[PDB]
Write a protein that binds this ligand. Structure first.
Ligand SMILES: Nc1nc2c(ncn2[C@@H]2O[C@H](COP(=O)(O)OP(=O)(O)OP(=O)(O)O)[C@@H](O)[C@H]2O)c(=O)[nH]1
Ligand SMILES: Nc1nc2c(ncn2[C@@H]2O[C@H](COP(=O)(O)OP(=O)(O)OP(=O)(O)O)[C@@H](O)[C@H]2O)c(=O)[nH]1
Ligand SMILES: [Mg+2]
Ligand SMILES: [Mg+2]
Lengths: 134, 50, 260, 424, 243, 386, 225
RNA sequence: UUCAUCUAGACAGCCGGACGGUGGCCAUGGAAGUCGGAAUCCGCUAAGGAGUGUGUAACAACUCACCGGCCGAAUGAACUA
RNA sequence: GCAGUCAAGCGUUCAUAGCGACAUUGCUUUUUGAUUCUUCGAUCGGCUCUUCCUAUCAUACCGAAGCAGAAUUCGGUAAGCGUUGGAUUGUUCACCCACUAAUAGGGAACGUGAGCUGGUAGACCGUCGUGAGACAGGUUAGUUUUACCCUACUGAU
C-alpha cells in the first residue's frame, strides 16, 4: 500500500547489509539497515529486493539530526542486470537509495540522476520529484 | 486464501464455463472438423490424378 | 549472573565498601543497593571509598569527602602497589571493625561499585602485590574471589554492577567506565559530551593541537595530525573517537565534576 | 482523545481465569514422567508458572493502557466521565488491577523456589500453589471488571467532540423544539417525542458554513433546581455550556405549548446566565405586556441578541444558523492569502482560448434518460473492467475511414520503416 | 471544478495532461478516468489514452500547450504515431533529445509563457523561444527547480506551493503577467502540479482536497460566476482559521 | 525433538520413483472425456521438438500493465509433419478396467512402420503384414467382422497412427506408433471415419489452431547418476566436512532403525516422463507457404528456421506448431500434443495472440542478422566475391 | 455511535422478521443440546460441563429451598491436657533433608550439605566463608515472617518470626533453624496488643507450623495461647 | 421403592377470568405489580401475588401463579438398582 | 496451604457424636491506576535433514458478544498448507528490534550412557595445607582413524 499498482517481478540486487548512495540534498549520503517490505520467509534466505521496493535504512554518512534514525524508502537504481518485459536487459552505474515516508511521500523535494521507469510508475511522488527518468 | 479446491471458487468457475468459454471451445471444433474434411477431399483429388 | 554474585558477596560480607570515582561519585553511587542494605541487612556497615583521587585536585576530593562524611565515613584513596594514599587509614578502619566483631573469628569485607572504579587495584594495594587481575577495560573481574590478610580480614572482589535506572542514558553510561567502546556503532556523536565535560585548556595541552571549533572538526584535525586516515583521504573519525572516549575514562584527559 | 473505542474486551473474573489457565494447559506441554531428569521436571513447571504470569499481566496491561487516564485528558471530558462513571470508583478499580499486576511477585518467588525442587511431587505442588494464588487474586477482582466492561461499552459509544472547534450549543427547557432544530439543521439520529427528558445524553451534529466545519450540540435539559442538588443528566449540560468555546442558542418557545411557562423559562435563563459571561449568546423564539417585559428582562443582559422564527419555515433556520456562525467567527479572529500582481511589463495581449464547442455544449446530468453513453456504460454493456478490450483506434483522424483496421510495418529486411518514412 | 480519483490516487500526474484543445490520459484497467473527463467535456475535444515509453506517468513525462506537444526520447515511434493520428494537425508534436526527460516536471507553461529548469540549453529550445510558442524563462520557485510539479498554471491565474514567498510570488507573476497565489492540495500537499490539472474553463483534482482549497482554486482560476480572485476578500478569515 | 525451525520439504513425493522411463516416447495416460454430441475429432498429435526461439507480441490484455504494450517471449517449435492412420482399436469396459478385444490394421503399410516392428531390418525378409494383406482379399469378411465387433461392443475407439520421419532431417528411418483417441460421437461413425481414413494423412491444422491451450507429454533429458544437492535441492555443508559436503549430513539426534523413502538420496536425474499442461499455440505454420517466420508487421520473407539451421537439428521443411515457453524434452525427441482435458476459465485461453516478429538469427553463437542477405549487406563485399 | 444507537434502531425498525420464532426454537432445542453435550465433549470440556451443571443444580435447589422456607448454657458460656495441635508428625530422613554437593574440577570431595527445606537463620546471619562453610542454607529458603492464626477470633496475621525452639526431628535441626511440619517457633505478637497482669506488654509467643513449607512457599502456623 | 392428584373430572392442550382500596409508602427528570429500599394488609371471591417474566420514557398490552369451561382416565415428583 | 463458617447428603440398631460435595471468610501487605520497573546459591546450545501429535499462531468455514462499519475478544470443526531474517559469550536454563498472513507448542535422544560443533600429562594467580598436595575458584594450551559384510534406502540389470 502507498504504491500504485501490482507486485511485479524484477531481479534482486540488494540484500540486507548493503550500503547504497543517496544523492538528494536532504542531507544523507548512505543507506544500510535490515528490512524489506513484502519479503518472503524462508530458512537461511536473505531479505533482498528491488522493483522500486521499499526498505528500512539508516544514514551511515550524513547529518547527525537524521543519523541514528531508522527510516523507510525506495530503491531507484540497482546496478544489477534487470530485464524489461519490452526487450533488453537494463542496468545502472550504481545503487541509489532514496528517502521517504510509509505513504511513498518524500522527505526531500528533488532527485539527482536517473530514476527507474518502473520505480517511478509505481511511486507517484518519486515521479514528481524526479526530473530525469532513465 | 481460498484454495484451489474451494467450493465457492469452483462454483463460480462452473458458472463461467457454460457461458463465454464453452462457446469459444465449441466453435473451434466445428472449424477443425471443416478442415479435417477438406484434408480428406484434397487427398481424394490427388488420388484422382492417376 | 552478575547480581547473583553481588548478593552472594554481600551475604558473605560483614563490611561493604562502596567504591566511587572521584570524577563522578554521584554517578557511580548505586543507591538501590544501599537502600536494600538498609532495609534487609542493618547489621552491615556500608562505608564509602573515593578512588582515583590522583586524577582530581585536592580541594575537590576534600569537598566530596566533606559532603559524604555527613552520611557515611567516606575515605579517600589512590590505588598503586608503589605510590598509594589512604592505605593505613583503611587498614585502621578495618581493624576497628575487627575489634568490634571479636566473636566471629573472621570478618569479611566486600567491594561493591561500578566497573572500572579500582576494586581489584585497592585489594592489590592492600596486599602490596598483584593478587587480582587488572585492566583498563571494564569487565576483567567476572566472578568473585576471596583474598586474605591478618588471618582475620577476608577481602572479596566483586564484578561491576550498574542498576537499570532508566532516567540514565546511553551517554551517561558511556561516560562512566562501563562499556567497551569498541562495540558501539557511532562514537562520533558522543564527542560533544567530551567537550562539555572537559576543559579546553587541558584538552589542547593533552593532544597539542590548538584552537578548534566544531567537535566534528576537532576529530578531523586530530586525525590529520596523527596520520590516522583511510585508503584515500577520509580521516578515520570512528577509531579516533573511540580512542578519545577511552582516554577520557582512563584518565589521559583530566576532567572532574564539581560538588555543591 | 476522541473515541476511546479501541479497548479490548474486559472479561469477568471466572472467564478470565478459565482463559488464562486453559491457554497454559493447551500451549505448554502437559506430559512429564518421574523417570525424567529433575532438570526437565523443573523446566516444565517453571515454564508453566511463567506463561501463566505473562498471560495475566498481558491481559491487565491491555486494560490499563487501553482505558484513558481520567485526569490528564481535558477538563470537559474529565468532568463528563466523572458525572457518568464516578471518578473515584473508576480510579479505585484501575488501581486494584494495577496492584494485582502481585502476580509477578508470585511467579518470581515460586520460580526461584522451584529451582530447588527435589521431586516431581514437590515441583507439582509448587506449581499448583502459584496458580492458586493467582486465582485467588483474580477471584478478588469480580466487581471491578464487571464495572469496567460496562464503562467500556459506554465510553465506546460516547461521541467524538473537539472542545476547540467552532461549536454551537442548543439549550432550552425540556420539550421545546431545540432537538428537532438539530434534526432539521443537521444529520443526526435523535428522538423528538413530547415529554421532558426524551434525550438523556449529549448529541452531536456537523455542518459546513463558509468552508468551515462547525459542530452543533444538543443537550438533554436543565431545570431550575437551586444547584446544590441536581442530577447527572443536567450536570452534563452545565459542564458543556461552561467548558466549550461556542456560541449558545437558548430556545424559548413563546407559546402555551412546552408544558412550561414563560416565567419559568426566563427564570432558568437568569439562573444560568453566569455561565454565559463569555459564550456569545443568542435567544430564539420558536408560533399582553408582562410576558414582553420578561423578554426585555433578558435583552437587558449586556451581550445578547433575540430572534423570532419557526420550525414551520426552513429558511429562517438557516438564517439564524448563519447569524450564530458569524457571531462566533468574529471574536474567534479577535482572539487569534496575499495575491500578487504583474505591474505592467509589456503590451503583448493575452486572452483565454476556448472553442465554441464547450459553450454550445450541455452539461452531464447523471439521471437523464437521453444523455451521452460515456464509455463506462459501453464497458458495462460489453464486459466489465478487466475484460473489455478498448480499441485505442476508432478515435483517430484520417483521410480515409475505410482503412481503420490497418497496421504500419515497423521492420523490413534489416531497416526500420519509421526512419525512412518521410512525406517527400 | 471537479474532484475524482483513479486507481486510488489523488495525484493526477499519474494519469493525465490537460490543455485547452486536448486531454491525454493513461491506459488503465478501467475506462473511468477517461469517462470522468468525457462527462464534463463530451466529444468536444480529443480525449486520448496512451502510455509514454510503456509508462502511465504521462503528465510528468509530457508537456504542451494548445499549439503543440513535447515528448521525450524514450518515447516510441508507435506511441508517437498514435498521438499524431489521434490529434489534429493544429497541434505540432515533437520528440526532444534531452538529459532531463520529465518535461512536465522540468517545464510549466501556458499558451503565452513558459518556465523551465535552469539547466541545459538547446538549438531547438532556443528556437522554441519564439518558433513554437513564446517566452521561456529560467527561474526557480523558492528553490524548488521542478517547476511543473511545484507550480500549476493557466492563462488566467497561477498556483504555487505554500513555502513560496511574497517577494518571489510578485517577481514570478511579473514574468507570467497574471496573478499568482500560494496554496496546498489533497490534505496538505506542496506538490500542486501532480495533484492538479487546470485550464481556462475546467479544473480536475483529487477527492481528498478540501473545500477551502477548492474555493481558492475556483477563485484564482475564475470558474464560478463570478470569482475574480478577490472573492478571497470574502473568504479571508476562512483561510485564516484554516491555516 | 521439534527441530527448532520449521522449513518446507526438499522435493516432491508425487514424482516418484525417480527412475528411467520405460520408453523414449511418453505414454498418454488420459484423453479428454467424450461428448457424443459433437463431430469426430482426434484427441492428440505427434511431433518432433526442434530448438527454441524468441518472438515479440502486441498484448491486448485488459487489467494488465502491458495492456497495449509490446512483450518479448520465448517459444518452442515442434516439427509436425502429417500423421498417417494405419489402424483402429476398440476398448471394452470391464469390472477390472478397460480391455482391448480387437485391433484392425490397414491394407498397405510403409517401410517405416515395418521398421518399427523390426529390430534388424537390413537382414530380414520383411514378411510383417503379408498374411493380413492377404486377409484383405475379395470381400474382407474378417476385416468387416472385426469392425462390426468394434461397432457393437468396445465402448471407446482409439486409432493407431504413425509419423513421417522420412520428412524430418533426423537420421532414424524408423517411425513412431501411437494410439490416439477419437472423441466425437457414434462409435459407428468413429469406425467409419477410420475406415475411410486408412492409408491417408491428418495434418496438424486439422487437430489444432491458434490461441489453443495444449498439453505436452514427453520424457525429460537424462543427465545420469546425480547427487543429492542437484537432484533434490539440498544445502551444501560448509567446507572440508568429514566424508564430504555434497550430501545430507544426518537425520538429527533421535534414533530410528531404518532409512526412509523420504530422505533425499542419490541416483538418476532425468529421462523421467512428464506431462506439462496449458501451453498456448502462437502459430500453426505450413511448409507449402514460405514466409512462415515473417509477420504482418515485418513483411520480410523468411522461414522460421534460423541461419545455419537449428542446432542438433536441421531445417523446417514441414508444417510446424509454435507454443510459448518451455516444454519437457530436448531437441530431437518425440512429444505428444494433447488438448487440455477441461474447459479453461482463464482469459489467457481467449486472447487472440498476434505476433510482430520472430527471431531467425543463428543459435550457433551470438546471432546478429536475421537473413544472409542482411549479413551480406552489412558486411559488404568480401575478398572472395570480387 | 453517539449513544444507544441500536436501541434506537430497534425502536424505529425492529430486530428482524425471524427473531422471536428463532429465539423460541433455540430455547426449545437447548434441552436436547444440553444432553447432547453431556454424551459428547470428551475430556476436560466434559468434566467442566459436569461441574457447571452440578453447581447450577445446587443453586436452583437452594433457591427453591429459600422460597419455601421464606413462605443449655447462657450467652457468655456459649461460644466456648496441654498437648500441642500436632504431636507425632511424619519423620524426615537426613537424606531427604540434606543434599550432597561436590567440589573440585574433578568433583571428588563432597563434604558439603545443602538443606533442601525452608529455614530460619536469624537477624545477623552473615554467611561463612566458602572454605569453612559446610551447611548451606540458601537465600530463597530463608523465612522471616509466618502466617500465624489465633484459633479464637478466627483471625490470621503476617507476623515476624523470632526463633525456632523445637523441631521434633533431631535437635541439630533446631540449631539449623529448619521449619518443617510440627516445628515450634517464637513469633512477635506486639501487633495484637497483648498485655499481662501487671501491664507488661507481651511481644513473643510460641506457635506451631501446620504445613510442609517445602511444598508451599507459605509458612502457616497456629498460636499456642 | 416412597409420597401425592384423580368421574365432587386428574396430566397435556385450546378458550375465558385473572378484580377492587391502589397509580399502597419511600425515593426521582420520570417508575402506576415488574430500575431500586423497606412493608407485604384487608376486601370481594370460583380464583386472582401490594405480583412470575417479556415490554413501555411512563402508562398500556401480553404472560404465570391461581380459578373455571370443553376434552374423558390415568398422571406427576423424588429416590434406588 | 493453614485455620474457619454454612449446609445437599451420609449418618453405632444415636435426632442433638462423627464425616461432608457445591458455596464462602481471613492471612498474602496498601484502596485513587506513582511501581522507577530493582534480578538474591539450578551439580547445556547449534547446524544438516525426515516424519509424527494437536493441546490451532496464520490461512478455510461457523457460533456468541453493545459486534454500526473497520479492527478486535471469546469459543466450535479442522494438522490440508506454512510457521523467518538478524544483534548480544564482562554468557543465553534468555532477551532485544524488525520483516511477516503468522513468526503455535511438543515427540521420535535427554525414562542411566550413543552422529557433526562449542562449552588426563604442561604452566600461572587465588583459598587451604608444616609439606608432598588438595581445591570455593579463575586463566591458558592440549592425536580415534568403518561400510569392502548383512539389512534398510536410493537408482540399475
Ligand atoms: N589513576 C588511577 N587509576 C586507577 C586507580 N585505581 C584503579 N585505576 C585504574 O583503573 C583501571 C580499571 O579499574 P580496576 O582496577 O579494574 O577496578 P575494577 O573495575 O573494580 O576491577 P575489577 O573488579 O577487576 O573489574 C585499572 O586498569 C587501573 O589502571 C587509582 O586509584 N588511580
Ligand atoms: N410550533 C413548532 N413546534 C415545534 C417545532 N419544532 C419542534 N416543535 C415541538 O417540539 C416538541 C418536541 O420537543 P423537542 O424537539 O424534542 O425539543 P426538546 O424536548 O427540548 O429536545 P431535547 O431536550 O434535546 O430532548 C414537539 O412536540 C413539537 O411540537 C417547530 O418548528 N415549530
Ligand atoms: Mg573492572
Ligand atoms: Mg424530548
Amino acid at each position: 500500500n502507498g504504491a500504485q499498482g501490482t507486485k511485479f517481478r524484477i531481479s534482486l540486487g540488494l540484500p540486507v547489509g548493503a550500503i547504497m548512495n543517496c544523492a538528494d540534498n536532504s542531507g544523507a549520503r548512505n543507506l544500510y539497515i535490515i528490512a524489506v517490505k513484502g519479503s518472503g520467509s524462508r530458512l537461511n534466505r536473505l531479505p533482498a529486493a528491488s522493483l522500486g521496493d521499499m526498505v528500512m535504512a539508516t544514514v551511515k554518512k550524513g547529518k547527525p539530526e537524521l543519523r541514528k534514525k531508522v527510516m523507510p524508502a525506495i530503491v531507484v537504481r540497482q546496478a544489477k542486470s534487470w530485464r524489461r518485459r519490452d526487450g533488453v536487459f537494463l542496468y545502472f552505474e550504481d545503487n541509489a537509495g532514496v528517502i521517504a515516508n510509509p505513504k511513498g511521500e518524500m522527505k526531500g523535494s528533488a532527485i539527482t540522476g536517473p530514476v527507474g521507469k518502473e520505480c517511478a510508475d509505481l511511486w507517484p511522488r518519486v515521479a514528481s520529484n524526479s526530473g530525469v527518468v532513465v | 486464501a481460498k484454495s484451489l479446491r474451494a467450493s465457492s471458487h469452483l462454483n463460480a468457475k462452473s458458472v463461467k464455463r457454460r457461458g463465454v468459454f464453452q462457446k469459444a471451445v465449441d466453435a473451434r471444433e466445428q472449424r477443425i472438423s471443416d478442415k479435417l474434411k477438406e484434408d480428406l477431399l484434397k487427398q481424394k483429388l490427388e488420388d484422382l490424378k492417376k | 549472573r552478575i547480581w547473583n554474585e553481588l548478593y552472594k558477596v554481600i551475604d558473605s560480607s560483614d563490611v561493604v565498601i562502596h567504591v566511587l570515582d572521584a570524577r563522578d561519585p554521584l554517578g557511580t553511587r548505586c543507591k538501590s543497593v544501599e537502600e536494600y542494605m538498609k532495609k534487609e541487612t542493618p547489621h552491615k556497615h556500608l562505608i564509602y571509598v573515593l578512588n582515583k583521587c590522583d586524577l582530581v585536585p585536592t580541594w575537590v576530593a576534600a569537598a566530596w569527602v566533606k559532603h559524604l562524611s555527613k552520611e557515611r565515613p567516606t575515605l579517600a584513596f589512590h590505588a598503586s602497589i608503589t605510590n598509594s594514599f589512604g592505605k593505613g587509614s583503611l587498614i585502621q578502619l578495618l581493624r576497628q571493625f575487627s575489634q568490634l566483631h571479636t566473636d566471629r573469628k573472621q570478618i569479611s569485607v566486600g567491594f561493591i561499585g561500578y566497573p572500572n572504579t579500582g576494586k581489584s587495584s585497592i585489594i592489590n594495594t592492600l596486599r602490596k602485590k598483584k593478587v587480582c587481575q587488572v585492566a583498563p577495560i571494564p569487565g576483567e573481574t567476572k566472578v568473585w574471589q576471596y583474598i586474605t590478610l591478618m588471618k582475620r580480614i577476608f577481602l572479596i572482589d566483586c564484578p561491576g554492577i550498574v542498576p537499570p535506572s532508566s532516567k540514565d542514558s546511553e551517554e551517561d553510561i558511556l561516560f562512566r567506565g562501563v562499556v567497551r567502546v569498541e562495540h558501539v556503532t557511532h562514537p562520533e556523536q558522543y564527542i560533544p559530551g567530551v567537550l562539555k565535560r572537559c576543559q579546553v585548556k587541558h584538552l589542547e595541552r593533552t593532544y597539542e593541537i590548538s584552537g578548534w571549533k566544531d567537535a566534528t572538526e576537532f576529530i578531523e584535525i586530530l586525525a590529520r595530525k596523527q596520520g590516522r586516515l583511510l585508503k584515500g583521504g577520509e580521516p578515520d573519525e570512528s577509531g579516533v573517537s573511540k580512542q578519545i572516549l577511552n582516554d577520557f575514562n582512563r584518565g589521559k584527559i583530566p576532567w572532574f565534576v564539581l560538588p555543591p | 482523545q476522541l473515541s476511546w473505542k479501541d479497548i479490548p474486551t474486559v472479561a469477568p473474573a471466572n472467564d478470565l481465569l478459565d482463559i488464562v489457565l486453559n491457554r497454559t494447559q493447551r500451549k505448554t506441554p502437559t506430559v512429564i514422567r518421574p523417570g525424567f531428569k529433575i532438570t526437565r521436571i523443573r523446566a516444565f513447571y517453571m515454564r508453566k508458572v511463567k506463561y501463566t504470569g505473562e498471560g495475566f499481566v498481558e491481559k491487565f496491561e491491555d486494560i490499563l493502557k487501553g482505558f484513558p487516564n481520567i485526569n490528564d485528558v481535558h477538563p470537559f471530558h474529565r468532568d463528563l466521565m466523572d458525572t457518568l462513571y464516578e471518578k473515584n470508583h473508576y480510579k479505585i478499580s484501575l488501581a486494584a488491577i494495577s496492584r494485582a499486576k502481585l502476580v509477578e511477585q508470585v511467579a518470581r518467588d515460586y520460580v526461584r523456589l522451584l529451582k530447588f525442587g527435589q521431586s516431581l511431587f514437590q515441583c507439582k505442588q509448587l506449581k499448583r500453589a502459584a496458580l492458586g494464588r493467582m486465582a485467588t487474586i483474580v477471584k478478588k477482582l469480580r466487581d471491578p471488571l464487571a464495572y469496567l466492561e460496562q464503562v467500556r461499552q459506554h465510553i465506546g459509544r460516547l461521541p467524538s467532540i473537539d472542545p476547540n472547534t467552532r461549536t454551537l450549543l442548543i439549550c432550552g427547557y425540556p420539550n421545546v423544539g431545540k432537538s428537532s432544530f438539530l434534526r432539521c439543521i443537521t444529520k443526526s439520529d435523535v428522538d423528538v417525542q413530547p415529554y421532558a427528558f426524551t434525550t438523556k445524553s449529549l448529541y452531536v451534529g456537523h455542518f459546513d458554513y463558509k468552508y468551515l466545519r462547525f459542530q452543533a450540540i444538543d443537550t438533554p435539559g436543565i431545570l431550575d433546581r437551586p444547584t446544590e442538588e441536581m442530577n447527572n443528566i443536567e450536570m452534563q449540560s452545565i459542564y458543556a455550556i461552561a467548558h466549550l468555546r461556542s456560541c449558545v442558542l437558548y430556545f424559548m418557545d413563546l407559546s402555551e405549548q412546552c408544558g412550561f411557562t414563560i416565567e419559568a423559562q426566563v427564570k432558568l435563563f437568569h439562573s444560568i446566565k453566569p455561565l454565559f459571561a463569555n459564550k456569545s449568546v443568542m435567544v430564539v423564539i420558536n408560533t399582553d405586556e408582562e410576558r414582553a417585559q420578561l423578554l426585555e428582562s433578558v435583552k437587558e443582559v449586556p451581550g445578547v441578541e433575540i430572534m423570532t422564527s419557526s420550525c414551520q419555515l426552513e429558511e429562517n433556520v438557516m438564517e439564524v444558523r448563519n447569524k450564530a456562525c458569524e457571531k462566533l467567527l468574529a471574536s474567534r479572529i479577535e482572539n487569534k492569502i496575499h495575491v500578487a500582481q504583474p505591474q505592467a511589463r509589456d503590451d503583448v495581449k493575452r486572452t483565454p482560448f476556448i472553442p465554441e464547442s464547450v459553450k454550445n455544449l450541455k452539461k452531464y446530468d447523471p439521471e437523464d434518460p437521453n444523455r451521452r453513453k460515456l464509455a463506462r456504460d459501453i464497458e458495462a454493456e460489453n464486459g466489465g473492467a478487466g475484460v473489455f478490450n478498448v480499441n485505442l483506434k476508432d478515435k483517430y483522424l484520417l483521410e480515409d475511414d475505410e482503412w481503420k483496421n490497418d497496421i504500419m510495418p515497423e521492420i523490413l529486411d534489416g531497416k526500420n520503416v519509421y526512419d525512412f518514412l518521410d512525406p517527400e | 471544478a471537479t474532484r475524482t480519483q483513479f486507481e486510488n490516487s489523488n495525484e493526477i500526474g499519474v494519469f493525465s495532461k490537460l490543455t485547452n484543445t486536448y486531454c491525454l490520459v493513461a491506459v488503465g484497467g478501467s475506462e473511468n478516468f477517461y469517462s470522468a473527463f468525457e462527462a464534463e467535456l463530451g466529444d468536444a475535444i480529443p480525449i486520448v489514452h496512451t502510455t509514454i515509453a510503456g509508462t502511465r506517468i504521462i503528465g510528468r513525462m509530457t508537456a504542451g500547450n494548445r499549439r503543440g506537444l513535447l515528448v521525450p526520447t524514450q518515447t516510441t515511434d508507435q506511441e508517437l504515431q498514435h498521438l499524431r493520428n489521434s490529434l489534429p494537425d493544429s497541434v505540432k508534436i515533437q520528440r526532444v533529445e534531452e538529459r532531463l526527460s520529465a518535461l512536465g516536471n522540468v517545464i510549466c507553461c501556458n499558451d503565452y509563457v513558459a518556465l523551465v529548469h535552469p539547466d541545459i540549453d538547446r538549438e531547438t529550445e532556443e528556437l522554441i523561444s519564439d518558433v513554437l510558442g513564446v517566452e521561456v524563462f529560467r527561474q526557480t520557485i523558492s528553490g524548488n527547480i521542478l517547476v511543473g510539479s511545484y507550480c500549476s498554471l493557466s492563462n488566467q491565474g497561477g498556483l504555487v506551493h505554500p513555502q513560496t514567498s511574497v517577494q518571489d510570488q510578485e517577481e514570478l507573476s511579473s514574468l507570467l503577467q497574471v496573478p499568482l497565489v500560494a496554496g496546498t492540495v489533497n490534505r496538505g500537499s506542496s506538490v500542486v502540479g501532480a495533484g492538479m490539472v487546470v485550464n481556462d474553463y475546467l479544473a480536475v483534482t483529487g477527492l481528498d482536497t478540501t473545500a477551502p482549497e477548492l474555493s481558492v482554486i475556483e477563485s484564482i482560476f475564475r470558474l464560478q460566476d463570478a470569482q475574480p480572485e478577490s472573492i478571497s476578500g470574502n473568504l479571508r478569515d476562512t483561510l485564516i482559521e484554516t491555516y | 525433538s521439534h527441530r527448532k525451525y520449521e522449513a518446507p520439504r526438499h522435493g516432491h513425493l508425487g514424482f516418484l520413483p525417480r527412475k528411467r522411463a520405460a520408453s523414449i516416447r511418453a505414454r498418454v495416460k488420459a484423453f479428454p472425456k467424450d461428448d457424443r454430441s459433437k463431430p469426430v475429432a482426434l484427441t492428440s498429435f505427434l511431433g518432433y521438438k526442434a530448438g527454441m526461439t524468441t518472438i515479440v507480441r502486441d498484448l491486448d490484455r485488459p487489467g494488465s500493465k502491458f495492456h497495449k504494450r509490446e512483450v518479448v517471449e520465448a517459444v518452442t517449435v515442434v516439427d509436425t509433419p502429417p500423421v498417417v492412420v494405419v489402424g483402429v482399436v476398440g476398448y471394452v469396459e470391464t469390472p477390472r478396467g478397460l480391455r482391448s478385444l480387437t485391433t484392425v490394421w490397414a491394407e498397405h503399410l510403409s517401410d517405416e512402420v515395418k521398421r518399427r516392428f523390426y529390430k534388424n531390418w537390413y537382414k530380414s525378409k520383411k514378411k510383417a503384414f503379408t498374411k493380413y494383406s492377404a486377409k484383405y482379399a475379395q470381400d474382407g469378411a474378417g476385416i468387416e467382422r472385426e469392425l462390426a465387433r468394434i461397432k457393437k461392443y468396445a465402448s471407446v475407439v482409439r486409432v493407431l497412427v504413425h509419423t513421417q520421419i522420412r520428412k524430418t532431417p533426423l537420421a532414424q528411418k524408423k517411425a513412431h506408433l501411437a494410439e490416439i483417441q477419437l472423441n466425437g460421437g457414434s462409435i459407428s461413425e468413429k469406425v467409419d471415419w477410420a475406415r475411410e481414413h486408412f492409408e491417408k494423412t491428418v495434418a496438424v491444422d486439422s487437430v489444432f489452431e491458434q490461441n489453443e491451450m495444449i498439453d505436452a507429454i514427453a520424457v525429460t533429458k537424462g543427465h545420469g547418476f546425480e547427487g543429492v544437492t542437484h537432484r533434490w535441492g539440498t544445502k551444501k555443508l560448509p567446507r572440508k566436512t568429514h566424508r564430504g559436503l555434497r550430501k545430507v549430513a544426518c537425520i538429527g539426534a533421535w534414533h530410528p532403525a531404518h532409512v526412509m523413502w523420504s530422505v533425499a538420496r542419490a541416483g538418476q536425474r532425468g529421462y523421467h516422463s512428464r506431462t506439462s499442461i496449458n501451453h498456448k499455440i502462437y502459430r500453426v505454420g505450413k511448409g507449402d507457404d514460405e514466409a512462415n517466420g515473417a509477420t504482418s508487421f515485418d513483411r520480410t520473407k523468411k522461414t522460421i528456421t534460423p541461419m545455419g539451421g537449428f542446432v542438433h537439428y536441421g531445417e523446417i521443411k514441414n508444417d510446424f506448431i509454435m507454443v510459448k515457453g518451455c516444454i519437457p524434452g530436448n531437441r530431437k525427441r518425440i512429444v505428444t500434443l494433447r488438448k487440455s482435458l477441461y474447459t479453461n476459465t482463464s482469459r489467457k485461453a481467449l486472447e487472440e495472440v498476434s505476433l510482430k516478429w520472430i527471431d531467425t538469427a543463428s543459435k550457433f553463437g551470438k546471432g546478429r542478422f536475421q537473413t544472409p542477405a542482411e549479413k551480406h549487406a552489412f558486411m559488404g563485399t568480401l575478398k572472395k566475391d570480387l | 455511535p453517539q449513544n444507544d444507537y441500536i436501541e434506537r434502531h430497534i425502536k424505529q425498525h425492529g430486530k428482524r422478521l425471524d427473531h422471536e420464532e428463532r429465539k423460541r426454537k433455540r430455547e426449545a432445542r437447548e434441552s436436547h443440546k444440553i444432553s447432547e453435550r453431556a454424551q459428547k465433549l470428551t475430556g476436560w470440556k466434559g468434566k467442566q460441563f459436569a461441574k457447571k451443571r452440578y453447581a447450577e443444580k445446587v443453586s436452583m435447589r437452594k433457591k427453591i429451598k429459600a422460597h419455601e422456607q421464606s413462605k443449655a448454657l447462657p450467652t457468655y458460656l456459649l461460644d466456648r491436657k496441654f498437648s500441642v495441635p500436632l504431636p507425632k508428625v511424619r519423620g524426615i530422613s537426613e537424606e531427604e533433608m540434606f543434599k550432597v554437593i561436590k567440589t573440585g574440577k574433578s568433583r571428588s570431595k563432597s563434604w558439603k550439605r545443602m538443606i533442601t527445606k525452608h529455614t530460619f537463620v536469624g537477624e545477623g546471619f552473615t554467611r561463612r566463608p566458602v572454605k569453612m562453610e559446610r551447611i548451606i542454607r540458601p537465600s530463597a529458603l530463608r523465612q522471616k515472617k509466618a502466617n500465624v492464626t489465633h484459633p479464637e477470633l478466627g483471625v490470621t496475621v503476617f507476623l515476624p518470626i523470632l526463633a525456632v525452639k523445637k523441631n521434633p526431628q533431631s535437635p541439630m535441626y533446631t540449631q539449623l533453624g529448619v521449619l518443617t511440619k510440627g516445628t515450634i517457633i517464637e513469633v512477635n505478637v506486639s501487633e495484637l496488643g497483648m498485655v499481662t497482669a501487671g501491664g507488661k506488654v507481651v511481644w513473643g509467643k510460641y506457635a506451631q507450623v501446620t504445613n510442609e513449607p517445602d511444598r508451599d512457599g507459605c509458612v502457616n502456623a497456629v498460636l499456642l495461647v
